[PDB]
Design a protein around this ligand. Sequence first.
Ligand SMILES: [Ca+2]
Ligand SMILES: [Ca+2]
Length: 279
Amino acid sequence: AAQTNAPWGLARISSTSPGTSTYYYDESAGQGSCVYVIDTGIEASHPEFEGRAQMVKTYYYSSRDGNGHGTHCAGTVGSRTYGVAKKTQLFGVKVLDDNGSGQYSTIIAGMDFVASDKNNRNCPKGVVASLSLGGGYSSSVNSAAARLQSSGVMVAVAAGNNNADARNYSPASEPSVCTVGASDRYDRRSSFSNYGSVLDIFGPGTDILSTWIGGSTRSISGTSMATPHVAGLAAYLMTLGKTTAASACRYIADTANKGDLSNIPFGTVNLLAYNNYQA
Ligand SMILES: [Ca+2]
Ligand SMILES: [Ca+2]
């Protein structure tokens, strides 16, 4: 399948070179996989989700996304127009408030919730969790991420937006999950993207068009935007049977575009997520 005039990030993950505008993908499109978006919530009623999104847990007064961040990320995972895996099932877990903030205790609870809840869902092709959040180093937060991964869920997390070594941030610094940096449309490391040896992979993160609340759309930037590209890609590859939850991050790194990015510090991987599609 081909989506013409795609958002640049989608086009980029299906090309060996920057500057293309078509997103090439297999028609299976993540059908049968499930992605948990652990964030400010999801506006499930947005036409772009086609009934494939639902809120399953909130830690606040409402399950509504009053912010937009969660809806944007969910859109990059699996919306019709803006999504990597256009037929995946999306589950929202609201661990962040409508200001985009949350306590570590709540974020940890949300991860433990997904590890259990997945056992009640029909996700025959596998389960992914996308975490576009983080803060300063916490061994408890890292441990929760490690547990979620260990339970059989592909965990993708944002590297962070401090232009610093991600070793000082959580859950970015947990080695067992998939830590995602951001790039821009000219194959440069995004100027805000964290780096360091704990990064596993880069994905598109600057000027990313996706869904927003109020049935709208907008373009924003961050490692928060790169992470759902990788989460969606994992769901897509799992549906194709190319990899499993335990090994998806490794497989994505193995099959990445290598050496395409500029402004990568020595010691940080030069790997850009790629779906290796061939018609
Ligand atoms: Ca290339
Ligand atoms: Ca890792």
